[PDB]
């Protein structure tokens, strides 16, 4: 770096290692400043100006900035591991102990989807939108919108494996950090997988709670038990109705969206199809009058026969749905 004594003259590789270590540190400092700014520039004024309610703001911001001391803790340890030099010899042991604590962000990241829903709901509110415009016009925001600041933890979290691997790249075979960074990489991959899965679980539960059943026969325990929502979104049925389909790992649920006070609910349509009994059929363009990018799903129609011809937005959109459903079916028969 430029901070370091000119006398300090090593290989290009170690300079890179020290640059990589330092880049991670600078990222932590930026992180801390922006989390404080998010609370102070967006949350607090909106609260004081009655632009949003306290409950609304708590739902949106949650514990966004609650783990500042976690990141400060890391900078402290890196600082104490730094020499009058400016150089850092070992960082693997620090990261191995510190990285598991990023568990703290599981809750915030899993509520981010719900927070975005409330924000989108506030697009109809002139006072909210004008305040957000005002922030965009001022230097502190760097022309970034509120959502960018709310997305700071998720955005930072997925950077850590890249930062760690860059440090490992410039770490000599003999150095003890080789083994330590490798463990630290496995650790962060573990916490990110867990955050990834819980976000999926929350999104799953989010839509499960919004399901509406007109007939009791339509209810199926495999829906409520779902923890992974593989694919969801709208498709056009043959009748022309825009259906909203939920592909859980074990069951596919077709729905018709319903106004419920600009709280969308999803009225279950016909019977949910267990992936166990699910048949997927590729249809050719023009096979059916709705005529492109269509496919069919049905029960293994030994069961009482229900089938749906569905139309995606384009050929590659069809592929997202077709592949997801096909993989789900294959996943089942792989485990029965």
């Amino acid at each position: 770096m430029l901070d370091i004594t000119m006398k300090e003259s090593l290989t290009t590789r170690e300079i890179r290692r020290q640059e990589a270590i330092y880049e991670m540190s600078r990222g932590e400092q930026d992180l801390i400043e922006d989390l404080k700014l998010a609370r102070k520039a967006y949350h607090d004024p909106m609260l004081k100006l009655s632009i949003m309610s306290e409950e609304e703001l708590t739902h949106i911001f949650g514990d966004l900035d609650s783990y500042i001391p976690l990141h400060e803790d890391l900078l402290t340890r890196i600082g104490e591991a730094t020499k009058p030099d400016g150089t850092v010899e070992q960082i693997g042991h620090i990261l191995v102990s510190w990285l598991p604590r990023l568990n703290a962000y599981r809750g915030y990241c899993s509520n981010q989807l719900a927070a975005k829903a409330l924000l989108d709901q506030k697009k109809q509110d002139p006072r909210v939108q004008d305040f957000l415009q005002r922030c965009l016009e001022s230097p502190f925001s760097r022309k970034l919108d509120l959502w960018s600041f709310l997305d700071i933890p998720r955005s930072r979290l997925v950077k850590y494996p890249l930062l760690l691997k860059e440090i490992l790249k410039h770490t000599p075979k003999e150095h003890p950090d080789v083994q330590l960074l490798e463990d630290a990489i496995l650790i962060i991959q573990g916490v990110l997988s867990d955050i990834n899965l819980k976000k999926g679980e929350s999104e799953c539960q989010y839509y499960i709670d919004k399901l509406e059943y007109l007939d009791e026969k339509q209810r199926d325990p495999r829906i409520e038990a779902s923890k992974v929502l593989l694919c969801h979104g709208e498709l056009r049925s043959k009748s022309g109705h825009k259906l909203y389909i939920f592909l859980f790992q074990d069951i596919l649920v077709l729905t018709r969206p319903v106004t419920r006070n600009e709280r969308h609910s999803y009225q279950v349509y016909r019977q949910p199809i267990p992936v166990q009994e699910l048949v997927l059929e590729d249809l050719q363009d023009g096979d059916v009058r709705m005529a492109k990018n269509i496919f069919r799903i049905r029960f293994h129609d030994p069961s009482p026969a229900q089938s749906h011809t569905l139309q995606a937005n384009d050929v590659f959109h069809k592929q997202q749905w077709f592949n997801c459903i096909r993989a789900a079916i294959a996943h089942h028969h792989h485990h029965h």
Partner: protein, 174 residues
């Protein structure tokens, strides 16, 4: 002000981050890059283009789609030194983008164009029975996925980079 959101999409190895960096340093090249707004002028229009990187999100299918809401243009990226990265565009990334970003304009970008005539590159690919991506392949793929357009750039020589984000801005203003 005119404000547009760009999200860059593609394989982790295709140099997505480098591209965003070089639109924002002979003194160092950062490994990671956070959200940044570039000021871009096209056809007498001043646009604030917010640049969202997706690096690191490739392996987390539940976290990744949070980058997609309110996107005005998708920068679909592959590297010319990697035919595999190009094949992942119709195979993986285009279906995902069509699903999460319906009716959002797409531009297709072939990065690392300086590696096309790199002898070392060509021999490494030749071992795997491959060759660098030809410009016609990018134009054809851009047609297939319904992209606004195709152009190439090199984050290394910075050639084409300015024009890429100007094309993205035009697509966004559509």
């Amino acid at each position: 002000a005119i404000r547009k959101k760009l999200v860059i999409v593609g394989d982790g190895a295709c140099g997505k981050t480098c591209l965003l960096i070089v639109n924002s340093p002979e003194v160092y090249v950062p490994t990671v890059f956070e959200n940044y707004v570039a000021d871009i002028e096209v056809d007498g229009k001043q646009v604030e283009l917010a640049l969202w990187d997706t690096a690191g999100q490739e392996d987390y299918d539940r976290l990744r789609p949070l980058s997609y809401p309110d996107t005005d243009v998708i920068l679909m990226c592959f590297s010319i030194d990697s035919p595999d990265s190009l094949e992942n565009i119709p195979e993986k990334w285009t279906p995902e983008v069509k699903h999460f970003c319906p009716n959002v304009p797409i531009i297709l970008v072939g990065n690392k164009k300086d590696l096309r005539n790199d002898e070392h590159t060509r021999r490494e690919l030749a071992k795997m029975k491959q060759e660098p991506v030809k410009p016609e392949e990018g134009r054809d793929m851009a047609n297939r996925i319904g992209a606004f357009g195709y152009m190439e750039c090199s984050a290394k020589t910075k050639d084409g980079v300015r024009e890429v984000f100007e094309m993205a801005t035009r697509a966004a203003l559509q």
